[PDB]
């Protein structure tokens, strides 16, 4: 929110960070079962993105990066490749959040985890 991914979410969606860090079955810590909607699928993919970074030896949950937003889009930067990779995962997710604003549903914010059912899609 005052931190990097949160700041990117706010810039790209017009929403508060708090409206995406606990949404559906995947936005927020961990994730299981079937994503509730397209925005949730952005978070399923983002989780997979961090998994890939972790396997490369990065710590994406802790990496801090630099970025700007202009009209060509989101520009990523950071001293290290792991910082830039984390930015790239976040950028993809924030763009996915913006793309799917049309089906964002307030009822899925702070979704009770017990409501998550079905299989867990593979990465
Ligand atoms: Ca998650
Ligand atoms: Ca939720
Ligand atoms: Cl991704
Ligand atoms: Cl990879
Ligand atoms: Cl900026
Ligand atoms: Cl962009
Ligand atoms: Cl843009
Ligand atoms: Cl640094
Ligand atoms: Cl690195
Ligand atoms: Cl709504
Ligand atoms: Cl809203």
Numbering used by the authors: 1 to 123
Question: What did the published study say regarding this structure?
Answer:
The mammalian family of secreted phospholipase A2 (sPLA2), which are Ca2+ dependent, low-molecular weight and disulfide-rich enzymes, plays key roles in many physiological functions and pathological processes by catalyzing the hydrolysis of phospholipids at the sn-2 position. GIIE, the closest homolog to GIIA, is regarded as a “hair follicular”, “inflammatory” and “metabolic” sPLA2. The structure of hGIIE consists of a typical set of three major helices (α1, α3 and α4), two β-strands (β1 and β2), and three short helices (α2, α5 and α6) around the second calcium binding site. Similar to hGIIA, hGIIE has seven disulfide bonds.
Two are apo-hGIIE structures at the resolution of 2.0 Å and 1.9 Å, with different crystallization conditions: without (apo-hGIIE_1) or with calcium (apo-hGIIE_2). In the hGIIE-LY311727 complex structure, Ca1 is 100% occupied, with the extra two coordination from the amide oxygen and phosphate oxygen in LY311727. In the apo-hGIIE_2 structure, crystallized in the presence with 10 mM CaCl2, Ca1 with 100% occupancy is seven-coordinated, and two water molecules provide the extra two coordination. In the apo-hGIIE_2 structure, Ca2 is 39% occupied and coordinated by carbonyl oxygen of Gly24, Tyr111, three water molecules, and either the carbonyl or carboxyl oxygen of Asp22. Amide oxygen in the 3-side chain and one of the carboxyl oxygen in the 4-side chain of inhibitors are coordinated with calcium instead of water in the apo-hGIIE_2 structure. Similarly in apo-hGIIE structures, a water molecule, part of the second calcium hydration shell, forms a hydrogen bond to the carbonyl oxygen of Cys27 and links the second calcium to the oxyanion.
